[PDB]
Amino acid sequence: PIVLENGKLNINIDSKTGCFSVTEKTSGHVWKSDPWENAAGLLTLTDSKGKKQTVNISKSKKIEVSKTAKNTVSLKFIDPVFEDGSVAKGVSIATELRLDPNNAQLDVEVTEHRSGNFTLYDLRYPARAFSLKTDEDKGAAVIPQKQGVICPSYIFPMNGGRFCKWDDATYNNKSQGSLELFNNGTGLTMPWWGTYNEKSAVMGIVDVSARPHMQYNINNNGQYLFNAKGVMSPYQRIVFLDPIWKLDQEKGKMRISYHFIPGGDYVDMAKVYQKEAKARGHFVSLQEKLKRNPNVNKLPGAIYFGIYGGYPHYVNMPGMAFTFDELKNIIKTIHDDLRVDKAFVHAWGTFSNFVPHNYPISEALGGPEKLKAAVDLAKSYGYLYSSYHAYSPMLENDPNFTTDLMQRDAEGKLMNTGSRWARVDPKFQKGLAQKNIEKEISYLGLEADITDITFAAYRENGKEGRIELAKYIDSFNLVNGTEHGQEQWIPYFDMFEGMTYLEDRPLSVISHPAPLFNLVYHEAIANFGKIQDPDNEVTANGDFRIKALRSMLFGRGTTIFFAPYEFEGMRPMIEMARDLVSPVHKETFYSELKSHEYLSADYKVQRSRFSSGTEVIANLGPVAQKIEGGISIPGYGYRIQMKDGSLKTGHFQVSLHMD
Amino acid sequence: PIVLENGKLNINIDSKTGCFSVTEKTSGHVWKSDPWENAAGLLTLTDSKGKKQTVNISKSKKIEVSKTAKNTVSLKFIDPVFEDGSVAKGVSIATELRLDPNNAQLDVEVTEHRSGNFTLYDLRYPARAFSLKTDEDKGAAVIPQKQGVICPSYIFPMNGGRFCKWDDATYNNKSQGSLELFNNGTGLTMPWWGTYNEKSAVMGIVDVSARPHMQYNINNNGQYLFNAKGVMSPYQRIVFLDPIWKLDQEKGKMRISYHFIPGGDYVDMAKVYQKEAKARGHFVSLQEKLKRNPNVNKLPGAIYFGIYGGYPHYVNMPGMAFTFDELKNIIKTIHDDLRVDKAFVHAWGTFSNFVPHNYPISEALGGPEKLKAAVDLAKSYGYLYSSYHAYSPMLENDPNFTTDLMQRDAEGKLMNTGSRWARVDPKFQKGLAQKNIEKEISYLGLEADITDITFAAYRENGKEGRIELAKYIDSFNLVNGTEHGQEQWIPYFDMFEGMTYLEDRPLSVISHPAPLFNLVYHEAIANFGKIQDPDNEVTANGDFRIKALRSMLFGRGTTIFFAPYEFEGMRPMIEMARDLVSPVHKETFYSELKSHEYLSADYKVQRSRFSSGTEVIANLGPVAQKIEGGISIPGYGYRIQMKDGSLKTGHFQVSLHMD
Numbered sequence A, B: 001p002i003v004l005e006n007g008k009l010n011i012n013i014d015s016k017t018g019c020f021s022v023t024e025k026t027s028g029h030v031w032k033s034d035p036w037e038n039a040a041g042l043l044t045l046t047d048s049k050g051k052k053q054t055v056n057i058s059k060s061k062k063i064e065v066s067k068t069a070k071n072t073v074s075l076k077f078i079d080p081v082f083e084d085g086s087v088a089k090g091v092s093i094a095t096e097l098r099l100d101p102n103n104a105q106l107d108v109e110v111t112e113h114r115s116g117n118f119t120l121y122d123l124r125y126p127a128r129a130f131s132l133k134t135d136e137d138k139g140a141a142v143i144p145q146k147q148g149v150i151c152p153s154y155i156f157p158m159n160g161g162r163f164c165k166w167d168d169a170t171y172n173n174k175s176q177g178s179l180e181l182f183n184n185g186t187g188l189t190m191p192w193w194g195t196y197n198e199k200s201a202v203m204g205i206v207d208v209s210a211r212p213h214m215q216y217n218i219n220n221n222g223q224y225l226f227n228a229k230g231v232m233s234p235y236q237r238i239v240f241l242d243p244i245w246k247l248d249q250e251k252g253k254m255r256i257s258y259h260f261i262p263g264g265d266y267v268d269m270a271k272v273y274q275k276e277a278k279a280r281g282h283f284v285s286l287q288e289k290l291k292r293n294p295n296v297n298k299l300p301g302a303i304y305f306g307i308y309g310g311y312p313h314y315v316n317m318p319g320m321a322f323t324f325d326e327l328k329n330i331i332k333t334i335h336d337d338l339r340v341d342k343a344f345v346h347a348w349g350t351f352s353n354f355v356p357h358n359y360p361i362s363e364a365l366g367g368p369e370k371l372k373a374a375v376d377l378a379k380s381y382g383y384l385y386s387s388y389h390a391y392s393p394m395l396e397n398d399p400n401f402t403t404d405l406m407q408r409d410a411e412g413k414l415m416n417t418g419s420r421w422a423r424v425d426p427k428f429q430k431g432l433a434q435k436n437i438e439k440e441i442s443y444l445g446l447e448a449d450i451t452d453i454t455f456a457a458y459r460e461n462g463k464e465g466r467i468e469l470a471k472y473i474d475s476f477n478l479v480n481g482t483e484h485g486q487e488q489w490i491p492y493f494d495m496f497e498g499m500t501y502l503e504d505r506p507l508s509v510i511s512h513p514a515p516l517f518n519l520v521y522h523e524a525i526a527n528f529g530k531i532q533d534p535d536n537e538v539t540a541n542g543d544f545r546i547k548a549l550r551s552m553l554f555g556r557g558t559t560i561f562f563a564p565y566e567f568e569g570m571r572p573m574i575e576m577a578r579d580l581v582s583p584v585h586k587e588t589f590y591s592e593l594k595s596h597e598y599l600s601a602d603y604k605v606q607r608s609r610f611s612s613g614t615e616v617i618a619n620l621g622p623v624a625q626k627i628e629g630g631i632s633i634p635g636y637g638y639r640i641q642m643k644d645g646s647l648k649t650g651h652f653q654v655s656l657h658m659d
Ligand SMILES: O[C@@H]1[C@@H]2OC[C@H]1NC[C@@H]2O
Pocket: A164, A165, A168, B312, B421, B452, B453, B483, B531, B532
């Protein structure tokens, strides 16, 4: 066995298989290689017949493991063997393990692959590494899926219905699969993931040039590997997260940097990535944004109101569209009657053309002077205001629809025919914004802007055009927001609408929300709830009680998103957000979310500490539970220590009024 | 055209294509053939290269259409043509259209299929028939997906976040797909579906011997057919539901019976199927079940309580399992402190072996005498009691696990290796129940039983053994329940736990819950909420306010499902259920749900009328809304007219207590 060792880690590499273990010498915890098959890696490739197979590369005909520098071990896997015993002659995978001389850090890189006459597809490398043994390790996988989740490595008490779904999912396909980086759907928002137990933590950070996928296995014993053969899995239930290198498309450096943290958990992992986030240039603080634009200080304590008039989906839809006088009266009511001191008013439906032609201000809704009266009233309150804007859609029902501005692929076929909100090639979007946005800014005296869709993901195709648009919008120095966001866009915006949770998502029944993204970026980007899952709707992610409490724990702002006819029914939730969430949001807005903790065995009682001197404890479940010192937190209750020394305690109550 | 006609309907059959239209003569409404491609049917079959292709059978080389009896047209589609111009020589499809001589009913049957040297798979027939034109027809598709949904054929006002998801889904793949019959997952619980507009309704009833799937297309213009070619769809937005005959599997009679109802909607469709349900023998009334067993009258007004002790998933799990004295004290508190007058107590975790060995009563939990003490207390209150029982699982973590009782398929491979709760072959399950259930009935003096898993679906494979088990359980004449249920099991049980809604399901963002199953079967089977999604949990299906109101509209009972540590948090919901839902459940229990109506444009205000003389109006959204007569229903509010003429009005309020 070949050893790399420094003061902090011992890497033990098996010369027969290329598998390796990592001893974290402070805690003494040992991370084992693949517990199931002793596979260093899992390679998907075509056979002689053109059929895809997945093979254990530790079964290759020749495996060469040599110490090639003081702290580098080079590995080569030559001529893998298929299930029938034929050989993939001429195929090979070369990798390197590089131990930092001083730090508890191990770089792992796929340096070369050779396909011969076959075709190489997925490579899981390292395979089923850094795993947790279910119900032996008491820890979790840590996955930055949108705002982020943890997946405990053991079964624990919880509501009976939740428990049945949770345990069942660890025995079927719900607990295995893969996610991608930097999308606004099911995927990851930061290029890292990790595992920890009560002794030690490990996380891996993906090279900035690479786009592996992430395979997950959450307490599953691998029965999914055996269902087609109709036999029972012989393997043990474990938790692992693996990189999937897409050998058929990846042109970047296939490197992942593992960082080992004695006694660490998901908080420590997030703080390690926060250093890398700064080095990558993503981290531009809200304090720096405020120095550039004093109006950023209209955001702390603001409720984000989306008044949804059926636009962009329809122009002047009966029963949905608001007139500009109606918009003014909603703003007046929010301030004068509901006493909301700070607000971001976002009016969806102010133009008489379909996006991406964001003009003119609609005559049918009252015309420019009446919109200006509404915006002026909002400004007189100190509120931020934006219309709905988008430069990416090309909509079937728009009389101006054309395919002129849609992108085509190499075969001349239209792209995004299945995604109507993202059809305009980004290389045209700055020019579309230039058609009217300066006119609207000048006429309405705008202080703010929100732009939809374009910055919800960070994909390679079209990135240059998106950057051009972001730089143009940023050049106006408005308080500005965008849908969902990604870390790469943080330099250009003050707020993201979203970066919370999908309602239906892989892992939903076997994970707990954890504020991973905000543990990294709360000081750099403000976030609010998503308009599809706002704080006034009851969804898989909770009702108002749960969402208000989670908002304060995670450091996000309230979103109230409604059709005009619903407005009277929003009043009680606006008042509760005003009294409970808004003062905490205001106090914590610029601060670091220093720590988050789960304080109850069912993960429903949680404690967040912010560098404003604010501590938020809340109980997201129905039953009162005790914490340290015999302090009781009511069901749907909170205990919040403010910087001014006051202690806010209380809880939500549902009551039945029988007349 | 060939014409079949009676006093009610004119069937216009195109001799060149085999397509047909149906004129409903009293309204003048014409149901059209396929609006997109004029296809009588869509056949999937292999080509000469063995690759699957889907073809329009109206493009076949020879189409024969002739009147072969007074009210029968015979069609034959001979030698379909592939997209490359080659011919599926020797393939043919024979169908018949048979008009009832008197009634507005058309039978449509695939009578013969010949594959030659090709292989046949799906046949949609009739293809894209009985469609609704989006935003012109103001009606809905009607789909008995679990309890049931309707899908409106037009866009309407609703909450902004819901609206965005709804409208977007009609343009992407969320609005097209297929569902299967008689499962407990995403599929249908009755073998019918339909469409209606403001003039006319049509529904199709699938022959009892057949298992087609059902294709849906909910306001989609067919863009999914063109995405791979990268072109924009040239078709219009429509609603349709098609049978998919599985030619490779189906051995039954491939017949669907269309019933045409002037002025009808989903209520009239349900009442048509109710007559068929009675003719099929599924309908055994709760009044008849009460005559056989007077203890059935312990169900009306009963809350169903599941005390979830971590079993069957684990034996005596710390932090989840209750002792029998703890169980007794929960029952006592429910009666004495919470004043619950009727209840079904269901205790999950009474045995010290894993299911399917439902014995002995656990010594570690206090032993048989202590369980008998808790059951005796429940009986002294007039409550129903059952332990958790299951005869179908074979669990990995059971020391007694064996594959001996698992089923093997035609290849000799184990079945359900990925489905641990349904691994025992049904042909063994009566013998497993016989091992101890009569001992438990005798020792505890049981009046009730609930059996998990086995009756949640109605698949062909294993149905004989499931019927044998159902007959055996039924022979005890206990008040009895089972998980989820299907119509075919109604003769054997008094209640179903479930028959409501999955949390995550196809069509969720573009449909409204409708009580289709209970419009048929409320007089014959009682249902309660599902334990995974109980009324004390906040899910995609609502919080307690929404679920309590929907329960009264739909005629189901309350489910409170909790781990023991949660009990104190359940108290407010138990009290509200007791005050609001239980008296209405009690009054309506045995009655017919005669009608259900949506009374507001956003479908959130609804009115149900029961043959007890009870009327429930409720508002499942947040804003007060007015109905006929200017009567206002508050948000999360109700107006209930009881049998004796008294009026109950009220609403739920969420409030924030701040110390
Ligand atoms: O987890 C499930 C749950 O207990 C066993 C599983 N089968 C049906 C019950 O609802």
